[PDB]
Amino acid sequence: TDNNPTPEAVADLKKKVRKLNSKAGQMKMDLHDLAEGLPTDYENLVETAEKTYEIFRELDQLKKKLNIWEE
Amino acid sequence: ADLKKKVRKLNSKAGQMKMDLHDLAEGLPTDYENLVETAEKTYEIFRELDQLKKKLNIWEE
Ligand code: NI
Numbered sequence: 609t610d611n612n613p614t615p616e617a618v619a620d621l622k623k624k625v626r627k628l629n630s631k632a633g634q635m636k637m638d639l640h641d642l643a644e645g646l647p648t649d650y651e652n653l654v655e656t657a658e659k660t661y662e663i664f665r666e667l668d669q670l671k672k673k674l675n676i677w678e679e
Numbered sequence: 680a681d682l683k684k685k686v687r688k689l690n691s692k693a694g695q696m697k698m699d700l701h702d703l704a705e706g707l708p709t710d711y712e713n714l715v716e717t718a719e720k721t722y723e724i725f726r727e728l729d730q731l732k733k734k735l736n737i738w739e740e
Pocket of ligand 1: 701705
């Protein structure tokens with residue numbers, strides 16, 4: 609049935625995961641660079657960490673979904 | 680079949696409750712009041728997933 613994952617669906621999710629892995633890498637590096645520059649811009653820590661967290665959380669969900677889909 | 684979709688669904692629920700309990704733990708003492716209800720739900724889902732997987736595996740053998 610349409611509900612169940614297909615090779616086509618898996619290929620698409622793989623594609624989404626790869627674009628997001630790049631974006632996640634960007635936030636990782638930006639957070640790293642923030643920490644390395646401390647104390648400058650310490651007021652930006654929580655915001656930057658939240659943004660970074662959200663992208664990695666989404667990435668982790670999709671990766672776990674992909675594994676389950678592939679099956 | 681199609682136990683497989685049913686196992687897939689529990690697999691996902693199990694993964695989410697794992698995340699939820701992990702986060703709740705790391706966040707302590709915040710929401711310590713929610714520990715037992717979350718553990719009970721997580722246990723129920725993993726138990727049911729365990730059994731259903733065993734069933735699918737007798738099936739498919
Ligand atoms: Ni942890």
